[PDB]
Design a protein around this ligand. Structure first.
Ligand SMILES: [Mg+2]
Ligand SMILES: [Mg+2]
Ligand SMILES: [Mg+2]
Ligand SMILES: [Mg+2]
Ligand SMILES: [Mg+2]
Ligand SMILES: [Mg+2]
Ligand SMILES: [Mg+2]
Ligand SMILES: [Mg+2]
Ligand SMILES: [Mg+2]
Ligand SMILES: [Mg+2]
Ligand SMILES: [Mg+2]
Ligand SMILES: [Mg+2]
Ligand SMILES: [Mg+2]
Ligand SMILES: [Mg+2]
Ligand SMILES: [Mg+2]
Ligand SMILES: [Mg+2]
Lengths: 134, 49
RNA sequence: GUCGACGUACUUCAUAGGAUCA
RNA sequence: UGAAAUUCUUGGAUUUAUUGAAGACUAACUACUGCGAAAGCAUUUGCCAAGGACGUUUUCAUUAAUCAAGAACGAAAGUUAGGGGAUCGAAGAUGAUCAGAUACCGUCGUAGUCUUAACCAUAAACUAUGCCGACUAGGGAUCGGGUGGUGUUUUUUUAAUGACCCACUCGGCACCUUACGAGAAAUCAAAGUCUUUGGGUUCUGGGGGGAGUAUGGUCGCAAGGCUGAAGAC
RNA sequence: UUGUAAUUGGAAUGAGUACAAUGUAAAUACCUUAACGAGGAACAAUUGGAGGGCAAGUCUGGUGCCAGCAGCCGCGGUCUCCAAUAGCGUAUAUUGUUGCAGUUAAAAAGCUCGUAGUUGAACUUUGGGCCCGGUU
RNA sequence: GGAUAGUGGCCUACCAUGGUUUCAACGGGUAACGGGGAAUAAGGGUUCGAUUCCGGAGAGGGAGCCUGAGAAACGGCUACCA
């Protein structure tokens, strides 16, 4: 005996035992209860819109440093302040205060990067293929 | 130099099957039929929102 | 009110051992 | 006491002896040996019922194993109402606050410790080890019963019993050796059942240890409104 | 005998243009096809990653001449390689019936009784003697 | 007995006290139309299926009807709600 019923007519005890024990899994619990998106950085979304409050590392002396590429952004969905990466200081010129920035998951502690500014791809602006509409 | 072996205390933290009843209601009762469509539909709506 | 408990989500500390050589 | 000091004391303390009273507890014998489902259980004698094991060429014939619901008991502490109140003693008070192996010591001691009628139902409630069934090594010690001997002691009339010695058999707490197997190891006759897995059944877990951070969540959580110091010359 | 060509020769061809015809209800397109249509064949293939080198240049630090960061900015003057390929990149998401474990690091309930549920000893025509037709 | 195209607590009158349930009724959730199917997996399984076919329901929300063999129809009608 393994501590589990084995009789040919004991199907029900096995099913009811399984259904009760399946809730132990954190993955299972999150999936059915729809709580798997609390841990998501954006609260379930793949991208986040934000307002550029300030360019923190604008005054850093060393060019192209990690600090120079960080911007403090307000998430419009909830108003929480977060920090985002820009691909390079050259791209930082495009970003200025009080524009919409679309953020995506990525100086430890910075977990976001800017992918679109003012509704235009930041990569496109860097490649000189578009103009930022103001 | 005498180091006694720790007494691993019996759990007082709520078990995984007990945590589900700590809130106001029984969390297991309020669950959807097809969680697969929950995750897919919810993610799309979040970006639309 | 930088209040308590719980739930949830994350961070963090504990990894070196044998042989040869100088 | 490390030394003191609260304390008692020429109205005689401490100590001696002859008693008397009160309430607990059953030393040494005492051993993880014995009994009980466990928690637990130890002075003598009586009564009441209960129980394992052993013996049976007695009796019924599947009446059985496990167990959600439900029920009885459940160490110590604790609550309600009486009784009792010796010792010890949470709390409280008080002496001293000098010295680090003796660094937490002393005195008074409320509740409790005991008991009666109900509650509370928690322990490292431990073999940190579910229950029933089968099988898989040798060895001698013990507890209860039973069988056997032309064995010792005893009955000091015999004897028969009782107590011992030896062999074995059932059941039990157990213990040594074991390249039998298992395990990383400690170790285990079960934590074993020839490489990876099925004799029956109940319960539990989905990861541990030591630190933190935040919280669109849940349940909770105060007081305050007439009060005013100044050695040098 | 290896690599590099804004070197060089004449052969081929469709993207595109277009008589015509086919196609279609009428058209467009396809398949056909006179005539044009290639050397930077400029008729100008992309998406990602990795690694350099350069200055009378700039910043920072120090056991001198150095090291780190990095370098579209200097006195005047108006580069290499790797992967996929008409496709490539980024972000989020993405329990054991067979077959788990419970002494020493998750988890055996303090003990017993007990309903449902699951499971539950053995035994009843076995053996023997012939006949037929099938396969390999 | 009435009604129905018709069986039937479908409804009416009188009667009895029945019916389901730990073999999970009743109640709650369902980002629940159901199926043929789709994905993955070595096998068991796990998930998806509004969506080319079949069947059901609806035409902003309830309620009620004429016509007609066939409708509680809505590119038919009437009220109420918005
Ligand atoms: Mg077994
Ligand atoms: Mg005894
Ligand atoms: Mg009392
Ligand atoms: Mg009780
Ligand atoms: Mg004990
Ligand atoms: Mg056994
Ligand atoms: Mg075309
Ligand atoms: Mg039964
Ligand atoms: Mg049988
Ligand atoms: Mg629906
Ligand atoms: Mg579905
Ligand atoms: Mg469908
Ligand atoms: Mg309709
Ligand atoms: Mg509409
Ligand atoms: Mg209608
Ligand atoms: Mg219509």
């Amino acid at each position: 005996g393994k501590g589990k019923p084995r009789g040919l007519n004991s199907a029900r005890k096995l099913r009811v035992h399984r259904r009760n024990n399946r809730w132990a899994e954190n993955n299972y619990k999150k999936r059915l209860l729809g709580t798997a998106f609390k841990s998501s950085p954006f609260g379930g979304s793949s991208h986040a819109k934000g307002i550029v409050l300030e360019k923190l590392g604008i005054e850093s002396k060393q060019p192209n440093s990690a600090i120079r590429k960080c911007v403090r952004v307000q998430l419009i969905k909830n108003g929480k302040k977060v920090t985002a990466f820009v691909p390079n200081d050259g791209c930082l010129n495009f970003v200025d205060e009080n524009d919409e920035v679309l953020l995506a998951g990525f100086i430890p502690g910075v977990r976001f990067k800017v992918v679109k500014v003012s509704g235009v791809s930041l990569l496109a602006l860097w490649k000189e293929k578009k103009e930022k509409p103001r | 130099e005498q180091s006694n072996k720790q007494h691993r205390k019996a759990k007082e933290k709520n078990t995984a099957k007990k945590k589900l009843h700590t809130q106001g209601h029984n969390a297991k009762a309020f669950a959807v039929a097809a969680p697969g469509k929950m995750a897919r539909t919810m993610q799309r709506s979040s970006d639309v929102n």
